[PDB]
């Protein structure tokens, strides 16, 4: 099957820019490309196909370009409808295949998380299971490492985090990460804490509770 | 006005088969190849296959060969792609488009997807959590607080606080999914630290799968 290498896999960028999406075959594909935009929760929607023909309706500041195996969608000056994740696809030999997507966000200041711990409730301490949650709120960029430790030994596999997208007012992010313990291992040890390490932070900051 | 209309949302128990339609309108059906497209979480979009109303000619990637079967109603004017084997590695929103008919092709007609989940979970509501101010603390001046939404199925579940009041600073985080194959979700509001005695702050959890709703206070301590 015909590989497709798109590049960058995201990229942050500013209103104004001229932002440029690769995608490489590798194969000669003639051609033969479309390209997509999503966004989240709605369906894609094709924007050029043949490698450089607009779609009847879609803004002039989408152009795609290239031939043989090296393509290219170019957004001449972004707007921020733009945002989302964009594909290209080649449909030139079955099985037709999509390069694995470019994620367009927002760039903005560097912004530190504030982070927070939060103890298991004793309403479910009850039940028999401990959850033990550390907030960083409002940061970006996205990147970011929380790591657990209990009485100092280091929590792994036991834990689950999820993002919140850019908001829509200052583009920052939002994360959770819950540490999940048996009551029983929870009553086992005596310093819970939350270390987490982001850009913004000129060094490692750590937050945590004892029982 | 050329129109793709796919299947409504659908839950199926693993090993189980399941046949999703897409009803084609505005345009002679026969002539136009259906094209399938897969979308789940974390792996972009990936190319089922494609069949033509009225010969009936068909094209499989061969990843999806044994798994997925094509049929095109053309009286109806409907197209389908039966799903078989279902594992939670099938768990995706699949679409159905329009692409190409003999030599030609201006661009796609995506339909709006069709939602597909496969476990073996039954439907249960949650239990709320507070996620309490301040470990040791009250003066610190800006404060969070929240409530930790626990082992729920199936999707989705809905969260206010204040009942709609109280927008500002809310956070609420994608659903997770937890080993017991049940969900988990957060909404976190950070507030004033000094509104922590001169305030309420309960969130409103609904689940209407289970007829579920519970309004939660949080607070210090």
């Known amino acids: 099957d015909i590989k497709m290498t798109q590049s960058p896999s995201s990229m942050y960028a500013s209103l104004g820019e001229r932002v440029t999406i690769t995608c490489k075959a590798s194969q000669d594909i003639n051609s033969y490309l479309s390209w997509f935009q999503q966004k989240p929760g709605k369906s894609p929607k094709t924007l050029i196909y043949r490698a450089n023909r607009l779609v009847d309706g879609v803004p002039s500041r989408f152009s795609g370009s290239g031939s043989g195996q090296d393509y290219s969608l170019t957004i001449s000056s972004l707007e921020y409808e733009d945002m989302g994740i964009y594909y290209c696809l080649q449909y030139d030999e079955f099985p037709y295949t999509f390069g694995s997507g470019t994620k367009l966000e927002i760039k903005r200041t560097v912004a530190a998380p504030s982070v927070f711990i939060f103890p298991p409730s004793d309403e479910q301490l009850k039940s028999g299971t401990a959850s033990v949650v550390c907030l960083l709120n409002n940061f970006y960029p996205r990147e970011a490492k929380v790591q657990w430790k209990v009485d100092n030994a280091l929590q792994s596999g036991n834990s689950q985090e999820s993002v919140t997208e850019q908001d829509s007012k200052d583009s920052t992010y939002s994360l959770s990460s819950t540490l999940t313990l048996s009551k029983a291992d929870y009553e086992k040890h005596k310093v819970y804490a939350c270390e987490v390490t982001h850009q913004g932070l000129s060094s490692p900051v750590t937050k945590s509770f004892n029982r | 006005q050329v129109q793709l209309q796919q299947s409504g949302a659908e839950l199926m128990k693993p090993g189980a088969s399941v046949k999703i339609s897409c009803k084609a309108t505005?345009?002679?059906?026969?002539?136009?190849?259906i094209e399938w497209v897969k979308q789940r979480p974390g792996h972009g979009l990936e190319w089922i296959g494609e069949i033509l109303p009225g010969s009936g000619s068909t094209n499989y990637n061969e990843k999806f060969k044994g798994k997925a079967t094509f049929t095109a109603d053309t009286s109806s004017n409907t197209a389908y792609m039966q799903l078989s084997s279902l594992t939670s590695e099938d768990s995706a929103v699949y679409y159905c488009?329009?692409?190409?008919?003999?030599?030609?092709?201006?661009?796609?007609?995506w339909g709006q997807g069709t939602s597909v989940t496969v476990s073996s979970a039954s439907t249960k509501g949650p239990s709320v959590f507070p996620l309490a101010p301040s470990s040791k603390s009250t003066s610190g001046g800006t404060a969070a607080l929240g409530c930790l939404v626990k082992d729920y199925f199936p999707e989705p579940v809905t969260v206010s606080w204040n009942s709609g009041a109280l927008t500002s600073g809310v956070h609420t985080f994608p659903a997770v999914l937890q080993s017991s194959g049940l969900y988990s979700l957060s909404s976190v509001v950070t507030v004033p630290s000094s509104s922590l005695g001169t305030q309420t702050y309960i969130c409103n959890v609904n689940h209407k799968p289970s007829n579920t709703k519970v309004d939660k206070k949080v607070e210090p301590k």
């Open positions: 488009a329009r692409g190409h008919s003999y030599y030609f092709y201006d661009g796609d007609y």
């Open positions: 505005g345009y002679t059906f026969s002539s136009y190849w």
